Amino acid sequence: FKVAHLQNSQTNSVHGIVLLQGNNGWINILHSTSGLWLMGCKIEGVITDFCIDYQPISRGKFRTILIAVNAYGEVWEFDLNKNGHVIRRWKDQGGVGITKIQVGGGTTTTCPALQISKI
Amino acid sequence: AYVLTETSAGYALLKASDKKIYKSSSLIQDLDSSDKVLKEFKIAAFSKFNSAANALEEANSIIEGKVSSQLEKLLEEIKKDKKSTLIVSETKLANAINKLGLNFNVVSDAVTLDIYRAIKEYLPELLPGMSDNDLSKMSLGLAHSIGRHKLKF
Amino acid sequence: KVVIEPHRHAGVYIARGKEDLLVTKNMAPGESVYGEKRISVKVEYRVWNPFRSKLAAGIMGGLDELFIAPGKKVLYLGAASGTSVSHVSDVVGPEGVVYAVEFSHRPGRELISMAKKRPNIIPIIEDARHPQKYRMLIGMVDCVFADVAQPDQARIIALNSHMFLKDQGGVVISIKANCIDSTVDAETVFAREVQKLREERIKPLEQLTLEPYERDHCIVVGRYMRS
Amino acid sequence: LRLFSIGGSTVVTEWDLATGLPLRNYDCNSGVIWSISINDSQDKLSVGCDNGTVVLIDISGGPGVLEHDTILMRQEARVLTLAWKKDDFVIGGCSDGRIRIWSAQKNDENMGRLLHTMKVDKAKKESTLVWSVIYLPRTDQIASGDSTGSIKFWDFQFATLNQSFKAHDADVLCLTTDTDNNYVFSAGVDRKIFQFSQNTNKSQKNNRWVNSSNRLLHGNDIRAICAYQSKGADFLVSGGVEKTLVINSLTSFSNGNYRKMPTVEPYSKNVLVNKEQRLVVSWSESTVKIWTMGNYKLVCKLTLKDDQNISTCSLSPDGQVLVVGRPSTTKVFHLQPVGNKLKVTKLDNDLLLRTSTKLVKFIDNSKIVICSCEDDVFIVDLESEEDEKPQEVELLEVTSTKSSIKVPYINRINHLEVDQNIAVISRGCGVVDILDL
Amino acid sequence: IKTKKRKTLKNLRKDSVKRGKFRVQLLSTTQDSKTLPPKKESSIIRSKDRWLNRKALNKG
Amino acid sequence: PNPKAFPLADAALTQQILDVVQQAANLRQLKKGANEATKTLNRGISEFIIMAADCEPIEILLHLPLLCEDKNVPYVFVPSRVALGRACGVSRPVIAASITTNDASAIKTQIYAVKDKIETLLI
Structure with a gap:
């Protein structure tokens, strides 16, 4: 599992989400306080890893992207603000037996932001 | 009507005595005998290939289905009768003949298969001046030329 | 010394002696089109290989009437490398004509190279789905042999047999069930192909599975009925 | 109009709608056919077969012409269901539990290539079979039902899953959708029809489907569902193992009324009654059972060899002659009362054996009138001095029209009645003609 | 009796007769394939009915 | 991909082929x-x-389909030589790999399953 920040954009309020890897390419995304099932994103093939990317939209607004990779090398990018629909899909060059995926150089799940402007 | 037969030796236009022969369904019964086929069809024109290179050019012309210049001249040697029926073995060759300037009409159908079977069966008898061995040698040379052109070879 | 026994079908012989083989007379003496054996008894015979090719796999299985005689003209479809085509040419002799059709260029080069020395073979490098393209080269033929490994073998034989084959001529087809459904017993596929030929117009006379030479292969022999 | 059927074999049958006979039996080149579909331009039939292959058939030549075009990239699992996107893509649900998209675009290197594969959520106890896929044009999506009961909506472009529902408790055999792709309907072994909706503007903007409703209207399973919409028509026709046809509304599925048609509507009859001998004659497929009524007894039961079902039967006024008419052949029996039962003998009439029978009636104990499947009307004297030619009856010619071109069977004789020398024929188009025999 | 009649009917309806190594098969009449669609492949489509009537679906 | 490359497999068959190639690499059943x-x-x-x-050029590989047609051996095309090399377990790109024959091999069932799936393409 991983923990990330989600802006709901109905009230522009930010709450934490818990993303759990499951079987059949599933990732289940839950509210971190309620525990309610917010959404779910499915990739094809045996899912091996996922990570969270953030993209600032405006002043005080940002979007959360789920980047999920299977064992083949196919990588899906979902927009968690737009009901978890797929932004894009691409392929890892070379790409076989992938175990890990990780973004870096910005706000990650390892190093989070202390405020929305720091994203 | 008229039928068009492409041989190894050269193009031929055979004048079928009945214009309704193409629409007629008794072709299999009528065309069984070699003498009957020779009586039914007369040689309107037999335009041979003078050169082996010209023969190969006409051969891949028929292969691609486009009408060659020599075939265009043979078709331009048309009868005075308007809307005469031409029978073409290949459908896209018939389409090209219709697209070209032609007062005569063109028909390609599965009924015509028995007719083309009769001419291909009794071709050396129908075509004058050509022996069976000569036609076979011409077919051999044309086949080797076509194969050598289609391959690099 | 060895003895030459005349096989039931014309132009086919059996060597008899210390070792027994199937042989055909050689059109070009002193030459072998591929690595087959030659026996000189004078007259020279080339040795058929029934494991290599499927026509006299059917002969060794005991086909009744082959439709291939020294007088006849034969249309060979699926003539890869000309290996069986050379023996068909040997059977039909100098008088008969074998029109060998092949699509692929890599066996096409060697088919042309063998037809260079063999006079009665007319090589065609052209796709077999389209009989109208090589209609200049063919007249009428007495028999049609098929060795194509295609799903629509019945359609290809229909198109070629309607257009080139004479009435009461013969159709000899080699069918592999693997290029067809291949998840049922091969007998089912063979029955389907026989029914397809009956639909086309070929009235079948006999069927022969080619064990031990090929697995799930049959030769279906039939007669064309234009009427 | 052309009608094609698959019936559990390797052969697609195209029907002659004028006569009701198989116009052509085209054997597809590989394997037992499970699924059939036609493309958008109606030039190509895609058939999905038992060995995993999908075969394209060019039918653009005309009525009676079918040709093999292409066999797409093979697989191991049975293709249980098929659908088309435009003329460009073929979607197929398979028995391994997954959905496959092949490219059927000519002039492309991807032609016949298996572009995408997507696995549905498998069942833990058993196998998973994707029984139905449909393609939604407006929202570029594939709707799928499987054996677990889950209805899934897939983004076509990325070949991904947008949305999933666990709606049915059993198999989802059939799916359909409306014209504007506002509603998707599913049905199966669960015996309920489920309506999913995108009708609201917010749902259209967000591309989110809502499990709007379900209705329990069938007594047994549901095998087929289909929908039609025009200015005067708005309905959803469904049927299954209950052998009865249920009609709903499309827009008013949840609220509007429904109608269950009778299981048997005897437009063509399978029971006749002979008044003089007090007999009831009923014919099923190859069986003719006769009862006497006075109290009811089964006097005789006829089992016939030919595989074709019996289309019609006719019994003489004295009760001796029974004419059994099939679209293949026609057979005549003489029935003699021997005790309780009747001894049955067969009379050989060459014309009737060679004759296809659509409608048959009797003038008397001797002469019969037959309208054939080729629409010709003639009179047979049955017993005669020799085997003379049957008497042909002249008929007026109905003028051809647009509907006669489109629907072929309307300009054919539908009803035939006779009394004494007068007879009445009526066409399907509504033409009534009197024959003085 | 009934078994003998069934055996006689089966022998009458049989269309393949073996003669040593050879086996003679009847060519079917041309009328049947014209008048009807081909007969269904029994086992393959019976798999579907067995699946629809499987026991995991408590169907009473 | 090149048109001469035939038969090219899809993503799922490529997955299964490369998994079996990895297993053969661990069992030293790979050339x-x-x-x-x-x-x-x-x-x-x-x-x-x-x-x-x-x-690039493909004709370094193109001699192998002729030998495979001669000896009746199944052959298949996977898209990436980098993927093939990483599955073969080496630090270099690999353009051709051969699964060797062993009856006591623990991966025999997987080898024979992928072999049949390849043969369906060659049909």
Whole structure:
């Protein structure tokens, strides 16, 4: 599992989400306080890893992207603000037996932001 | 009507005595005998290939289905009768003949298969001046030329 | 010394002696089109290989009437490398004509190279789905042999047999069930192909599975009925 | 109009709608056919077969012409269901539990290539079979039902899953959708029809489907569902193992009324009654059972060899002659009362054996009138001095029209009645003609 | 009796007769394939009915 | 991919092929390189041949389908030579790999399943 920040954009309020890897390419995304099932994103093939990317939209607004990779090398990018629909899909060059995926150089799940402007 | 037969030796236009022969369904019964086929069809024109290179050019012309210049001249040697029926073995060759300037009409159908079977069966008898061995040698040379052109070879 | 026994079908012989083989007379003496054996008894015979090719796999299985005689003209479809085509040419002799059709260029080069020395073979490098393209080269033929490994073998034989084959001529087809459904017993596929030929117009006379030479292969022999 | 059927074999049958006979039996080149579909331009039939292959058939030549075009990239699992996107893509649900998209675009290197594969959520106890896929044009999506009961909506472009529902408790055999792709309907072994909706503007903007409703209207399973919409028509026709046809509304599925048609509507009859001998004659497929009524007894039961079902039967006024008419052949029996039962003998009439029978009636104990499947009307004297030619009856010619071109069977004789020398024929188009025999 | 009649009917309806190594098969009449669609492949489509009537679906 | 590359497999078959290639690499049942694949074809000890469709020029690979048609051995094309090399377990790109023959091999069932799936393409 991983923990990330989600802006709901109905009230522009930010709450934490818990993303759990499951079987059949599933990732289940839950509210971190309620525990309610917010959404779910499915990739094809045996899912091996996922990570969270953030993209600032405006002043005080940002979007959360789920980047999920299977064992083949196919990588899906979902927009968690737009009901978890797929932004894009691409392929890892070379790409076989992938175990890990990780973004870096910005706000990650390892190093989070202390405020929305720091994203 | 008229039928068009492409041989190894050269193009031929055979004048079928009945214009309704193409629409007629008794072709299999009528065309069984070699003498009957020779009586039914007369040689309107037999335009041979003078050169082996010209023969190969006409051969891949028929292969691609486009009408060659020599075939265009043979078709331009048309009868005075308007809307005469031409029978073409290949459908896209018939389409090209219709697209070209032609007062005569063109028909390609599965009924015509028995007719083309009769001419291909009794071709050396129908075509004058050509022996069976000569036609076979011409077919051999044309086949080797076509194969050598289609391959690099 | 060895003895030459005349096989039931014309132009086919059996060597008899210390070792027994199937042989055909050689059109070009002193030459072998591929690595087959030659026996000189004078007259020279080339040795058929029934494991290599499927026509006299059917002969060794005991086909009744082959439709291939020294007088006849034969249309060979699926003539890869000309290996069986050379023996068909040997059977039909100098008088008969074998029109060998092949699509692929890599066996096409060697088919042309063998037809260079063999006079009665007319090589065609052209796709077999389209009989109208090589209609200049063919007249009428007495028999049609098929060795194509295609799903629509019945359609290809229909198109070629309607257009080139004479009435009461013969159709000899080699069918592999693997290029067809291949998840049922091969007998089912063979029955389907026989029914397809009956639909086309070929009235079948006999069927022969080619064990031990090929697995799930049959030769279906039939007669064309234009009427 | 052309009608094609698959019936559990390797052969697609195209029907002659004028006569009701198989116009052509085209054997597809590989394997037992499970699924059939036609493309958008109606030039190509895609058939999905038992060995995993999908075969394209060019039918653009005309009525009676079918040709093999292409066999797409093979697989191991049975293709249980098929659908088309435009003329460009073929979607197929398979028995391994997954959905496959092949490219059927000519002039492309991807032609016949298996572009995408997507696995549905498998069942833990058993196998998973994707029984139905449909393609939604407006929202570029594939709707799928499987054996677990889950209805899934897939983004076509990325070949991904947008949305999933666990709606049915059993198999989802059939799916359909409306014209504007506002509603998707599913049905199966669960015996309920489920309506999913995108009708609201917010749902259209967000591309989110809502499990709007379900209705329990069938007594047994549901095998087929289909929908039609025009200015005067708005309905959803469904049927299954209950052998009865249920009609709903499309827009008013949840609220509007429904109608269950009778299981048997005897437009063509399978029971006749002979008044003089007090007999009831009923014919099923190859069986003719006769009862006497006075109290009811089964006097005789006829089992016939030919595989074709019996289309019609006719019994003489004295009760001796029974004419059994099939679209293949026609057979005549003489029935003699021997005790309780009747001894049955067969009379050989060459014309009737060679004759296809659509409608048959009797003038008397001797002469019969037959309208054939080729629409010709003639009179047979049955017993005669020799085997003379049957008497042909002249008929007026109905003028051809647009509907006669489109629907072929309307300009054919539908009803035939006779009394004494007068007879009445009526066409399907509504033409009534009197024959003085 | 009934078994003998069934055996006689089966022998009458049989269309393949073996003669040593050879086996003679009847060519079917041309009328049947014209008048009807081909007969269904029994086992393959019976798999579907067995699946629809499987026991995991408590169907009473 | 090149049109001469035939039969090219899809993503799922590529997954299964590369998994079996990895298992054979761990069991030392794998020969790497077009020369060694040629040797196994000649010696008759090859189950099937995997070739990388993005080899440039492809004619280094193109001699192997002729030998496979001669000896009746299944062959298949996977898209990436980098993927094939990483599955073969080496630090270099690999354009041709051969699965060798062993009856006591623990991965025999997987080898024979992927071999049949390849043969369906060659049909």
